[PDB]
Amino acid sequence: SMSVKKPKRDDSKDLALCSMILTEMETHEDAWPFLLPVNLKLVPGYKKVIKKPMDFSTIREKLSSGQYPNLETFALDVRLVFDNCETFNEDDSDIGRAGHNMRKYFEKKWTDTFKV
Numbered sequence: 202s203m204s205v206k207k208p209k210r211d212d213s214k215d216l217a218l219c220s221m222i223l224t225e226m227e228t229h230e231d232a233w234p235f236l237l238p239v240n241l242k243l244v245p246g247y248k249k250v251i252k253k254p255m256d257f258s259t260i261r262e263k264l265s266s267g268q269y270p271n272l273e274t275f276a277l278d279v280r281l282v283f284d285n286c287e288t289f290n291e292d293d294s295d296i297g298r299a300g301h302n303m304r305k306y307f308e309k310k311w312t313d314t315f316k317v
């Protein structure tokens with residue numbers, strides 16, 4: 202509360218670490234469904250069904266222009282990618298399993314990197 206400060210972690214390296222994590226995501230062989238925005242004119246239903254589309258290139262732009270206030274908002278967008286993927290694709294479709302794989306890959310890196 203007012204004049205009662207909680208010890209807070211060093212966040213000075215968060216931007217650089219989030220960037221390195223995103224790069225590893227981008228270079229994963231199963232990253233191909235998530236590199237660019239889903240083409241709304243090509244995929245029937247996506248615009249109507251998915252209220253908040255997200256992809257790695259959009260995350261990369263937001264990260265590169267100071268649109269993430271903190272690392273938690275960054276993880277929210279990353280998880281949004283895979284949440285959207287689960288909504289629209291069957292679990293054992295090529296795109297569907299890519300999403301499950303990529304989510305698992307992200308969460309371990311997240312823990313290994315920040316949750317010390």
Ligand SMILES: Cc1ncccc1N[C@H](C)CS(C)(=O)=O
Pocket residue numbers: 233234235238239240241243244285286289290296
């Ligand atoms: C991730 C996702 N989710 C739902 C449908 C498609 C996709 N990914 C596609 C590769 C994008 S497209 C078909 O090139 O426009």
